Structure formats: C-alpha cells, structure tokens
Amino acid sequence: GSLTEDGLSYKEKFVVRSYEVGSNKTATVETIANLLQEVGCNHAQSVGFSATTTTMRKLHLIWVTARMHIEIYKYPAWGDVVEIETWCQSEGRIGTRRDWILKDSVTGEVTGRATSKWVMMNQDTRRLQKVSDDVRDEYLVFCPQEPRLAFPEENNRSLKKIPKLEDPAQYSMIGLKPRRADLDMNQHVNNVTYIGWVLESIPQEIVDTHELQVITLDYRRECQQDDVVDSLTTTTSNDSQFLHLLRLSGDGQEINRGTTLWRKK
Amino acid sequence: GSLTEDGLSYKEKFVVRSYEVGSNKTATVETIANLLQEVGCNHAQSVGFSTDGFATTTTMRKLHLIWVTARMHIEIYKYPAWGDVVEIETWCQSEGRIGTRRDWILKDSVTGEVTGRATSKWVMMNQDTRRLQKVSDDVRDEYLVFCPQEPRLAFPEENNRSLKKIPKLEDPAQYSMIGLKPRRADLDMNQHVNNVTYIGWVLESIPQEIVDTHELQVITLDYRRECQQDDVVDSLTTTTSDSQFLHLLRLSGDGQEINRGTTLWRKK
Ligand SMILES: O=C(O)c1cccc(Cl)c1
Numbered sequence: 208g209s210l211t212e213d214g215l216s217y218k219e220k221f222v223v224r225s226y227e228v229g230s231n232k233t234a235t236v237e238t239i240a241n242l243l244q245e246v247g248c249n250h251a252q253s254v255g256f257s258a259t260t261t262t263m264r265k266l267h268l269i270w271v272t273a274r275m276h277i278e279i280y281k282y283p284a285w286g287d288v289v290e291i292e293t294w295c296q297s298e299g300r301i302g303t304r305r306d307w308i309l310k311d312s313v314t315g316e317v318t319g320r321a322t323s324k325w326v327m328m329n330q331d332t333r334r335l336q337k338v339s340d341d342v343r344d345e346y347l348v349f350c351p352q353e354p355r356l357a358f359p360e361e362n363n364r365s366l367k368k369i370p371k372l373e374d375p376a377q378y379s380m381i382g383l384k385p386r387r388a389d390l391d392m393n394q395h396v397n398n399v400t401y402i403g404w405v406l407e408s409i410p411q412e413i414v415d416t417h418e419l420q421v422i423t424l425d426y427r428r429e430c431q432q433d434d435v436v437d438s439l440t441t442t443t444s445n446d447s448q449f450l451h452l453l454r455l456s457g458d459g460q461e462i463n464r465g466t467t468l469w470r471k472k
Numbered sequence: 473g474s475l476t477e478d479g480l481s482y483k484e485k486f487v488v489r490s491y492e493v494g495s496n497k498t499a500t501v502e503t504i505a506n507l508l509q510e511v512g513c514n515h516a517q518s519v520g521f522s523t524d525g526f527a528t529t530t531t532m533r534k535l536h537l538i539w540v541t542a543r544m545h546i547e548i549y550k551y552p553a554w555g556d557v558v559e560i561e562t563w564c565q566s567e568g569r570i571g572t573r574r575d576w577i578l579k580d581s582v583t584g585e586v587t588g589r590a591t592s593k594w595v596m597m598n599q600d601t602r603r604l605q606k607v608s609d610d611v612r613d614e615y616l617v618f619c620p621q622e623p624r625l626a627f628p629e630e631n632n633r634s635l636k637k638i639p640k641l642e643d644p645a646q647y648s649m650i651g652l653k654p655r656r657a658d659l660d661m662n663q664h665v666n667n668v669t670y671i672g673w674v675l676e677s678i679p680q681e682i683v684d685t686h687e688l689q690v691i692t693l694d695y696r697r698e699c700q701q702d703d704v705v706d707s708l709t710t711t712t713s714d715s716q717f718l719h720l721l722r723l724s725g726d727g728q729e730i731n732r733g734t735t736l737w738r739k740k
C-alpha cells in the first residue's frame with residue numbers, strides 16, 4: 208500500500224485467500240473487517256502514529272472503537288484483487304471517524320464501504336474524555352480539511368439509535384469464549400471477533416437463503432480473555448432485519464448491541 | 473506466486489499483517505498454518521487440480537474420493553515479524569499407495585535464510601462413508617507428473633521427529649480447557665471445520681506461564697476424526713519433560729478422540 212498523491216488518504220491491494228471465503232465461495236464480512244483494520248494500521252504507521260500520538264502515550268490515552276458500520280454490495284471471490292482506500296477525520300472534541308471504500312480492482316466499481324467512530328479513553332481507568340487542542344492539532348494535518356464521507360446521504364443508516372433487545376430473545380448462542388488467536392498483541396479481544404459472535408445466533412435458514420448487506424455494531428464494554436458471552440438475535444421485519452445483543456453469560460452485563468440487514472440470494 | 477522453473481514446486485511471497493501477530497509481535501503458528509494451506513491451494517490450482525481443499529483429480533470426483541490430512545508436522549526457527557516478507561515453497565510427493573505427502577519450506581525473503589519447515593501426510597477417503605482405501609495406479613498416473621521423481625524431503629533425516637508414534641494421554645490430564653465450539657468463521661466453503669482450528673484448540677490448554685516464558689518450536693498433530701459444526705471439544709495437555717507436552721482433543725460428551733499431538737517449547 209501507499210499514501211495517495213495529496214498524502215490525506217491511504218490505498219492498499221489484497222488478493223482474497225482460500226481460507227478467507229465462506230459458504231458462498233466469497234469473502235466473509237469478518238475477513239473484510241480484518242482488511243479494514245490492516246489498511247487502517249498501515250495508514251497510521253505511514254504517517255508515524257503507533258494509533259496513539261506522543262502526547263497520548265504521555266497521558267496513557269488510547270483510541271477505542273465506539274461504533275462500526277459496514278455495507279457490502281458484492282463480496283469478493285477467491286483470487287479477486289480488492290482495493291481499499293481509507294482516511295480519518297476530526298469530529299472535534301467528540302473523537303475521530305475512520306472511513307473506508309472497497310473497489311473491484313479490475314472494473315473500478317465500489318463493492319462496499321465502511322465507517323467507524325473512535326473515542327479517546329484512559330488506558331488504565333477506562334474513562335472516556337473529550338479531545339483537547341494539543342492532540343487535535345497533531346493529527347489534523349493528516350486529515351482532509353473539507354468533509355469527505357463514505358456515507359454522505361443526509362440520513363444514512365450508520366447514525367441511527369440501536370435499542371436494547373428485550374428477553375425473551377428469538378434466537379441465542381450460549382457460552383461463547385475467545386481463544387488465544389482472538390487476542391491482539393496486547394491480549395485484548397479482536398474487534399472482528401464480536402462480529403463473529405453477533406452472527407453466531409443468526410438462523411441457518413437465513414444463512415442458506417440470504418446474504419448480509421449491512422451490519423452496525425456499538426461497543427459498550429470489552430470482553431476479557433476469561434469472559435463468556437451469550438449472543439441474542441430477534442427478527443424486526445424480501446429483506447430481513449435483526450436486532451442483536453452480546454452480554455456476559457453470567458450477570459448479563461452488555462458488551463455489544465447491533466443491527467444487520469440481509470438480502471435474498 | 474508461481475510454479476518454479478521446472479514446474480515441480482510452487483513459490484509464493486506473503487507480507488505479514490497486523491491481525492496475524494500474537495503476544496510476541498510475531499506471526500502465530502495458526503497464521504503460518506493458514507499461509508501453508510493458501511500456497512497449497514495456489515499450487516493445486518496452477519496444475520489444474522480441485523480448489524475445494526480436497527484437491528480431487530478427474531478419476532476421484534466421480535468415485536466420490538477426497539484427500540484428507542492424516543498428519544501435519546511444523547518446525548519454526550523464527551516467527552516472521554509484522555511487515556516482514558516471507559517466501560514459502562511447496563511440493564507434493566507420492567508415498568507408494570499409502571497416500572500423498574505435501575512439504576513446505578519457509579524463508580526470510582531478505583536474508584534467504586530458512587526460518588521454518590513443514591510436512592503433512594494425506595490419505596484418500598470416500599466422502600459419504602468416511603472410509604479410507606489405498607491409492608490406485610490409475611489416480612497416480614495423473615498426479616506423479618506434478619511431483620519431483622527423485623525423493624525431496626523437508627525433513628530428510630532417516631527416522632526424525634515428524635515420524636514418531638504419539639500415544640493417548642491418560643486421565644487425569646495435567647491441564648484442560650473444556651466446552652470448545654467452532655463458530656461459522658472456523659468452517660471452510662464445504663462447511664467442514666478447517667484443520668488449522670484444531671491447532672488453536674490444542675494450544676488452548678497450554679499453561680499461561682509457558683506462553684509467558686517459552687516460544688513454540690515444534691507441533692505434530694494426528695487427525696483421527698472430523699469435528700462437526702455442532703460438536704463440543706475438550707483440550708487436554710500433560711507435560712512430558714526445553715518443555716514438551718502430550719495433547720488430546722475429544723468430544724466433550726462421550727470423550728471420542730478427534731486429535732492427538734505433541735509440542736516442543738524453547739525458552740525465550
Ligand atoms: O451470518 C452468519 O451466520 C455467518 C457468519 C460467519 C460466516 C458466514 Cl458464511 C455466515
């Protein structure tokens with residue numbers, strides 16, 4: 208990959224691998240999510256972040272994902288070359304936003320697009336705080352100055368409020384644990400693993416007859432190495448809609464909530 | 473990647489990715505194992521064989537016959553760091569009518585040094601029946617033209633590590649992790665649990681203090697029976713000693729064996 212001409216976005220090419228495809232001989236949303244985070248990491252390194260600044264490292268401050276929204280038109284096939292462009296922007300003191308565009312390399316057409324909100328947090332106390340000038344002024348030089356939105360539409364489906372699923376849930380998958388391969392280098396559960404967990408309680412009937420178009424996922428609380436998660440899903444509707452909740456299998460503490468949209472194969 | 477000059481092996485380069493690295497900012501053996509399968513698929517496609525993981529030929533598909541991993545053996549000297557470029561060469565080789573063998577060599581692309589090597593034994597099996605059967609001469613004729621004719625061995629040494637007999641762990645196990653289920657991302661396009669997930673499950677019951685002080689050098693895994701989508705696994709480990717462990721996977725219920733293995737760990 209490489210920074211674009213104007214040094215305000217980053218592009219990278221990927222060849223979809225045999226182990227990255229699912230039931231439809233096409234790439235899973237989890238794989239696509241992995242490619243989002245990889246190109247995110249390449250961009251952060253390209254401009255010298257490591258995604259903390261020296262100011263952030265001094266104050267033990269980290270970015271964490273508050274929300275993730277992914278929309279896929281076409282899942283790329285094994286051996287297909289996909290191009291992903293990414294950029295991130297200030298939302299002032301609220302936090303940053305990273306956005307992605309996925310293209311078919313050969314035809315040049317948009318096959319998916321994604322957006323995510325990141326909030327600034329104390330590493331140790333786990334306490335969210337508004338973004339200060341010093342921090343903003345260090346990263347604003349690496350962001351397009353004009354607004355550039357992957358989801359421009361004046362009311363798109365990335366910024367709607369996700370309600371809490373109510374017991375009893377229609378579908379459930381019980382006793383979900385992360386394994387050591389689900390842990391980043393810092394022993395924090397990978398963000399893409401929550402996506403797997405949410406989809407675990409989607410019914411087989413739907414996997415068989417429908418394909419996933421849109422997923423929106425709120426991050427409330429991280430799941431630790433020795434936590435257990437229950438995955439809850441209820442229908443809310445050609446198209447199929449589902450309300451989702453991850454919560455700790457014991458006391459039922461919420462870690463994630465979300466929505467998915469499925470179109471008929 | 474590409475078939476080498478003589479069309480009897482296949483070479484491919486990988487750039488190690490952020491999500492591919494573990495606790496020591498280096499690639500997991502699960503990622504390595506993934507890249508081994510990837511280059512194996514790329515080789516099988518480049519010479520016209522099946523891309524299903526089963527690597528079927530013409531006189532195999534109609535007899536409903538598939539290749540199945542009986543055994544896998546991996547040794548890593550160095551684990552590639554994030555952004556490091558790694559080159560993997562793979563080839564296939566006939567083992568009489570007992571089955572086929574696939575080997576790999578890992579190199580650091582920059583220094584050309586060997587940093588890992590692997591070998592695996594495949595057996596032919598009728599899908600629907602889960603049988604076995606030795607290989608026929610009619611099948612061999614159309615896959616021996618794609619193998620080096622003279623023997624070529626990742627682990628050439630006569631009576632080496634990859635060919636020792638692994639015994640059944642006896643209750644009680646020293647370490648256990650129980651109630652392990654596969655998720656949908658653990659299943660290939662055929663809807664079978666991908667054989668790299670077993671590697672993951674075996675290491676789940678490695679003590680944490682060993683993860684903190686040692687690095688994994690060797691793993692050897694026997695594949696007895698496939699775990700279904702709706703099966704549950706317990707992972708059992710016992711120290712046999714450098715640290716050595718004996719491993720067992722078995723259905724959480726009736727304790728039906730699915731895998732046995734050994735791992736060798738070196739001090740960091
Ligand atoms: O939504 C699902 O059930 C799902 C989850 C992971 C992979 C696939 Cl193909 C489907």
Ligand SMILES: O=C(O)c1cccc(Cl)c1
Nearest residue numbers: 387388494495675678683
């Ligand atoms: O069990 C282990 O040692 C293990 C398994 C997966 C990843 C890592 Cl870093 C370690």
